[PDB]
Design a protein around this nucleic acid. Structure first.
Ligand SMILES: CCN1C[C@H](C)n2c(c(O)c3c(=O)n(Cc4ccc(F)c(Cl)c4)nc(C(=O)NC)c32)C1=O
Ligand SMILES: CCN1C[C@H](C)n2c(c(O)c3c(=O)n(Cc4ccc(F)c(Cl)c4)nc(C(=O)NC)c32)C1=O
Ligand SMILES: [Mg+2]
Ligand SMILES: [Mg+2]
Ligand SMILES: [Mg+2]
Ligand SMILES: [Mg+2]
Ligand SMILES: [Zn+2]
Ligand SMILES: [Zn+2]
Lengths: 210, 269, 213, 269, 214, 210, 210, 212
DNA sequence: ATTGCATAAGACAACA
DNA sequence: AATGTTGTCTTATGCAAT
DNA sequence: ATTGCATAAGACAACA
DNA sequence: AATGTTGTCTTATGCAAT
């Protein structure tokens, strides 16, 4: 868990998806800090597919300070080189897939493939997805994997990048700092401001403040 | 002049009558200056809705446990009341293990039939593994009350107290002041069950058993005057059963069955 | 129903140690009540009959054999206290102990099939004996046997579900109390009453309502 | 036929209504057959006579003690109410030592005057040596209540709860939610004593102070209808004071002053 | 009448160390003296004193004191304005602002040593008995006479009598006419026992049957 | 004119741009309160392109509630009309040219065309965009209108993207705007919509709102 | 002591008041402190017999008379007096602590009371021939039927001679085996059945038995 | 006329037994209610002897609120009245030999004579008795009079020295039999006890009613 | 007559 | 040794007006 | 009209 | 998770008789 903020260090790669065929290739941008995703679509490896990718990602999630990559042939191509020269962000090499350069974009590719597969089976497409439902099934996949928190954390990846009542205790006092969530017919549930935990208590055992 | 009253209350927190007398004031200034202090009114309306019940026989049951010193060394008795007809079944064992509850529920099934639900408190052998899997195998619901108030099971607790009353009365009117020999255990058990079940209690015209086997349930009753929480009564509702304590009312269109206190309900026209 | 009963004791080997199997069968309903006994006594019969009375009610007679425990004084004055008229019989006669023998056969078959289907062959666990007893009682009391259109319970108790309150008269404006009315609910101060013909509900004062017949 | 009922109750202990319905019986046989079992009636009349009071100001006082967390580290407050006029004096110390009671009673003397008696519970520095000879040196009576019920001094306990209410309302209406600084201790004490004493409480027309200093006491009042123990009511008696709760009545010849509940008294003709 | 003007000052009493600053409150319509002692001399401590004194005696109308630092300091000023008492200052010891103050100072400085020698305390009463000493001194200074009249200060201040009747109320009569000339004695539930102002005839009459008079 | 809150109101239209031939049939869509503009290309007016565009908008902006659109045979087509119910999104369609609702979308169309122009003749693809450059040029222009400026604002668009009862006050008038969450037999627990504050008001001081 | 009419302690004393008949005779019952004194100015067998017999006439027939080794008390006349009277005699010094000392204390009381009576009449040391019997009889009456000490019963009164209710205790159960000694208006004292210790209890915490 | 009260009125007289000689004279002192007597049998009759006997009797028996004697020069002497003022007892006199308050005195006097004579004939002295056994004869006579009952009377003269309201209950027959006294009354029943068997039984408030 | 009012009557709670 | 109390609240009731 | 009755209404308690 | 209950007692009230 590096302490640097978002928009700092990027990671990029492609993937081959015969489900999206004949548009069989995809790529996703991920950040070592926020782990947010931006997706494109293509059917061949070109120096301009990465350019579509970079434009889409920098538009969706702002600009990157630095990008770490692999030794692909078209990454050094003249077109994308002039593009980067205009941009202002540096380009870096590596050994293609070690533990320092490629951080999490590989697992991002795997997770995207399995998520698109599970969505395709949810709406009923086993073998491959046609060139129409591509955008829809994608959009559902990104929305589920970014707009919702995944795993466990104090803040969602997008964040990264009850009236008060007094309850009784067996001692017999009236503790303060409880908010009722659901008000049943003769029962109740209370969440404490500090400990943010819910406990169920009857109605004849609760009285509020003020 | 209500400002002498304002300063006086804010600095001194006086009852409304002394404020009215101490500054030559009257109804309104007194009342709605005395509410303005939040400390003068903190508790004084505690919500209390009080209503467990089942509608027809073998719909909802209840369960608790009993320590009866006269029944040593088998003092642990389970209790089970059928809320619709108030019939009682009680069994005897040694410990509060799940197997005792197994046998108790099996005997209660053999006597009364098969219910749908069993409301209760969360005993240690009760939300247990074996008890839950066995109840699932039998195929009836299981609805625990709030974990800590032994009051949502007020019916089984009350029939528990009544059972202890009857059992003690019989035992110490039979010549046994402290405890019971092993011979008269079944005596006291079966005698308590026969006395409570087949003979009416209180003022009602109906026996618990022939309440349980020949029940009376209305399909469309009379109109009544009842609470919506909006603050006071409306009409356009019907009552299904009106016990002495609490009653059940039914809508005319929504067709709800809700248990409300008899305070909430009063006769139509 | 609840006019003549029966009783007997038949050994069950798998029930060790409490292996003596009391039975009680009504005639007009053929219900069955059963409990375990470590060894037959003149107090075990009283215990079993107290249990049977709790489950079914109070009969008007009993027809057991001439066994040692059924004849001893204890049970005699027990039945004298209750009001149940004892009447013994030849230990095996068909004018007496016939349907109780049929119930013995039915119960033994039910216990065998339940024990085998629960995973046991010759020894039911001691903690699981009353479990099988209650299962047998439930199955033989609440379910039809063979070609019976009813179970024992329906014959025994007549489980009709009536829907109208008891017949009651109301103080008519002429001062008389006309019958043919039925209460439905006893609220506060008032008791809603229908008419057996017009089917109209009218809330009436509690002081003016009194039962019919 | 009441003897089927005799056997049925003696062996079975049935309620009277089921006995009446189960043997074709009527009112009498049922009622005085269900008496005959001593177990069917054991508790149901617990005698309750409830009456402490003093008649005129500075006649009878009371005393209790209070733990007030807001007043740390001097949380121990002594309370004293004058039963005739309901005037309250409260003081503050560190321990429950006899010296604290010395100072508290001295201040109460300086404020209200000199009483005749002080009813109470038996505190550890209370029936102690020093307190007893000091009270003898001052020369006033001292009548402890029953040792263990903190109820015979119900007035000081009730005024204790009232004082705690007032003190907490003033404290946490002043911006102090948990406890009080050493500066505002005298604030709270003096405000609590001033609010309660010089301003009326409830509905009564009269202030505690001008009850204590200009009391009204009747010399011969109206006739009433009261108890003897003989079971129900006689007349030929007069009432001295009839409080909201409980009253004092006086004979016409024996000239007794006895405190009896207001249930015990009702108006003549 | 009573409770019209108050007075106050301090008094250095070495006999009560370490609490060596003792404050005195003196009424002038009845001379009902009230005293209290405080270790330091700040605003909050003397305000504590005033609170205790008003608790014992009640709300005055004016308080004539010296020109001291705290008697007119801010805290005291808005505090008294909140209470609603007309503060007044003057020359520190003038025969108008400290007329009865020094008289009661002499009385208290006499009584303190009289009782200290009565219980045998010469140099300094221990820090545990000053409270009871001051309470006894105030009791002997207020409830007991030092003048030469038949009215104690308590007899002057609170106007102590022993009544026999309460407020008069007007009963109405069975024909519908209300009638004064009757006074209430017992508010029994349902029924009031009201006495005829002329013949001392009490009668049990219902609650709504009677109304207050004037 | 400035909205009330993001992800609650939307507005769309149809546009044709000759330089994107053959796929010159866009379907423009902009938010009102948050003013987020997103588009997607196609070459015929149809239900399929409309549903693809709306499903893409769903996850590029947020799950919709009720989108105000224009007249046509595409919004009202059976597939699209039932699609609106499938996603639970409503319709308040207006005149094909209604000024109250579509002046903003038409101005957005003018902005889009002008940006596409300026940036395209910036790179050097003057008249019409070939197949492999359309995606990147659309990305370039939307990029020019994502996170630099919108044209005038100091607060940019995507930088922004119980039963009612009357109560009583000491004033004597019965003010509205209060909804009860939890009820009691001596008071209530009301909450205003605007200030979203919960206060316990006694039952004497309430009356139903209509 | 346990019961009167049991132990008698007769001793003789000298009072200079009744001189020359200055010797005196007095009996004392240790169980009752009752006193008989008969004037006798010559310590003789006849005198002790007469005083003993007048004491029997006054108080009652005893069971034993306790005196010392005075030779006028074990004489054949006195021995046969005791024999025909069917009582017992024990000798002594006297001067035992527990016994034969209350008689000396009573003698001190006698001399003091006769002295105070005489000085109240106007006699200092010598009393006339018509006053000695008067004064001794007055002293007898003053001592006998007027209580001396701190008891509730006079010395002659020191001469010859409920329903069960259950009570609730701290744990809340009701225990039998108690009875009511005294019953006031809101209180009663309850004594146990076996230990017989009396404790006080509120009237509300007691309920009858059977 | 005996229901006034014990230790209240005392009657005294001089009867001369033929046996106490040569210390012949004798004074008596009796109580009407208690029937308790005590004597000394002096050898002289005079006001001093009168008061010696009187103040022995008051020591023996109790404190009367009045002591009565017949009028004469043997009871009105001024030293006697000084003794009276020393005790403060009211006094009155009557005819010497009337039936107002002396018939019982002379009856008791003849009783004393007969008891003394039978005791003397028991001992062995027929007419006179030595000056050493007079006291013992008096002792036996006094004990026989006081401690034991005279005649059929159940009440001994000792028993007349220092000695719940009646209620009637309902039986199933409804008989309002007497003989019950409440001990700890209640508002639903009573705690009555019989006057002879003295057994406690709580009976309903709806079955008891007052006796007179 | 119906709604609202001005008061009286009754119910709950808690203080080591 | 030597006993519940009463401020605060709720509901019901009757007068007064409309 | 007064006493007694036959019933209805309300109050208390305790169940780990 | 998921809410007091009700037999027994007391008092008040109204009918019925005398
Ligand atoms: C662990 C299993 N368990 C949990 C606890 C131990 N518990 C269980 C009980 O049966 C009871 C019980 O009956 N009561 C009596 C009671 C009190 C007040 C009422 F309103 C009602 Cl109706 C009943 N109380 C408790 C209790 O815990 N604290 C009062 C209790 C029980 O078995
Ligand atoms: C040792 C000194 N001492 C003895 C005990 C500790 N105690 C003393 C208290 O003041 C109280 C007290 O106030 N209350 C409260 C209370 C409870 C029920 C009532 F009815 C009322 Cl009139 C008051 N209870 C107790 C108590 O012991 N057990 C409940 C108590 C006390 O100071
Ligand atoms: Mg329980
Ligand atoms: Mg339980
Ligand atoms: Mg206390
Ligand atoms: Mg205390
Ligand atoms: Zn306030
Ligand atoms: Zn019984």
């Amino acid at each position: 868990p590096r302490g640097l903020g978002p928009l700092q260090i990027w990671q990029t790669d492609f993937t081959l998806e015969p489900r999206m065929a004949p548009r069989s290739w995809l790529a996703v941008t991920v950040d070592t800090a926020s782990s947010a995703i931006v997706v494109t679509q293509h059917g061949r490896v070109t120096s301009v597919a990465v350019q579509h990718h970079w434009a889409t990602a920098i538009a969706v999630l702002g600009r990157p300070k630095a990008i770490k990559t692999d030794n692909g042939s078209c990454f050094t191509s003249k077109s994308t080189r002039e593009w980067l020269a205009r941009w202002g962000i540096a380009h870096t090499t590596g050994i293609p897939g070690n533990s320092q350069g490629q951080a999490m974009v590989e697992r991002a590719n795997r997770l995207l493939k399995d998520k698109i597969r599970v969505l395709a089976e949810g709406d009923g497409f086993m073998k491959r997805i046609p060139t129409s439902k591509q955008g829809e099934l994608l959009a559902k996949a990104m929305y589920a994997l970014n707009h919702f928190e995944r795993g466990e954390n104090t803040k969602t990846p997008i964040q990264k990048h009850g009236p008060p009542v007094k309850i009784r205790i067996e001692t017999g006092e009236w503790e303060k700092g409880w908010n009722v969530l659901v008000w049943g017919r003769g029962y109740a549930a209370v969440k404490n401001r500090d400990t943010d935990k819910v406990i169920w208590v009857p109605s004849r055992k609760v009285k509020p403040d003020i | 002049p209500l400002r002498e009253a304002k300063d006086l209350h804010t600095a001194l927190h006086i009852g409304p009558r002394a404020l009215s007398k101490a500054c030559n004031i009257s109804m309104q200034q007194a009342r709605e200056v005395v509410q303005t202090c939040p400390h003068c009114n903190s508790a004084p309306a505690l919500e209390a809705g009080v209503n467990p019940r089942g509608l027809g026989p073998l719909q909802i049951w209840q369960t608790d446990f009993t320590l009866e010193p006269r029944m040593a060394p088998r003092s642990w008795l389970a209790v089970t009341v059928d809320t619709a007809s108030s019939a009682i079944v009680v069994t005897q064992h040694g410990r509060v293990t799940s197997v005792a509850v197994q046998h108790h529920w099996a005997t209660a099934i053999a006597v009364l039939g098969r219910p749908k639900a069993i409301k209760t408190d969360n005993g240690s052998c009760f939300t247990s593994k074996s008890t839950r899997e066995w109840l699932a195998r039998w195929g009836i619901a299981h609805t625990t009350g709030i974990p800590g108030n032994s009051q949502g099971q007020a019916m089984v607790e009350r029939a528990n107290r009544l059972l202890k009353d009857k059992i003690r009365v019989l035992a110490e009117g039979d010549g046994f002041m402290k405890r019971i020999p092993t011979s008269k255990q079944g005596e006291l058990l079966a005698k308590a069950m026969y006395a409570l079940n087949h003979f009416e209690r209180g003022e009602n015209t109906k026996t618990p058993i022939q309440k349980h086997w020949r029940p009376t349930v209305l399909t469309e009753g009379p109109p009544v005057k009842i609470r919506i929480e909006t603050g006071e009564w409306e009409k356009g509702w019907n009552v299904l059963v009106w016990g002495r304590g609490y009653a059940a009312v039914k809508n005319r269109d929504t067709d709800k069955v809700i248990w409300v206190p008899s305070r909430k309900v009063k006769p139509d026209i």
